Curated annotation (Swiss-Prot):
Acts as a transcriptional repressor. Involved in the early stages of mesenchymal stem cell (MSC) osteogenic differentiation. Is a regulator of podocyte gene expression during primary glomerula disease. Binds to promoter DNA. This is Zinc fingers and homeoboxes protein 3. It is found in: Nucleus. Widely expressed. High expression in kidney. Expressed during osteogenic differentiation. Residues 61-69 have a biased composition (Basic and acidic residues). Homodimer (via homeobox domain 1). Heterodimer with ZHX1 (via homeobox domain 1). Heterodimer with ZHX2 (via homeobox domain 1). Heterodimerization with ZHX1 is a prerequisite for repressor activity. Interacts with NFYA. Residues 8-66 bind DNA. Belongs to the ZHX family. Induction: Up-regulated during osteogenic differentiation of mesenchymal stem cells.
């Protein structure tokens, strides 16, 4: 199955190579299944728990960004 929970909030920027594979997958779905994850794991070189965390940390970032207010910044 899929599972991944984190306590405190950290700040880590994924690599340019790992993302390329992730960002590409995201488009399809924010929470990909194991199968689809097995493939990405090859490029991202991470574990189900690692990747799973990303999405939950990414898909959530894109949902907050672009705040109604006028804030011209990274995304």
């Amino acid at each position: 199955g899929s599972s991944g929970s984190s306590g405190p909030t950290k700040y880590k920027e994924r690599a340019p190579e790992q993302l390329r594979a992730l960002e590409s997958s995201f488009a399809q779905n924010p929470l990909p299944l194991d199968e689809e994850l097995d493939r990405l794991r090859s490029e991202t070189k991470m574990t189900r728990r690692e990747i799973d965390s990303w999405f939950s940390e990414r898909r959530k970032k894109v949902n907050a960004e672009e705040t109604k207010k006028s804030g011209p910044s990274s995304g």
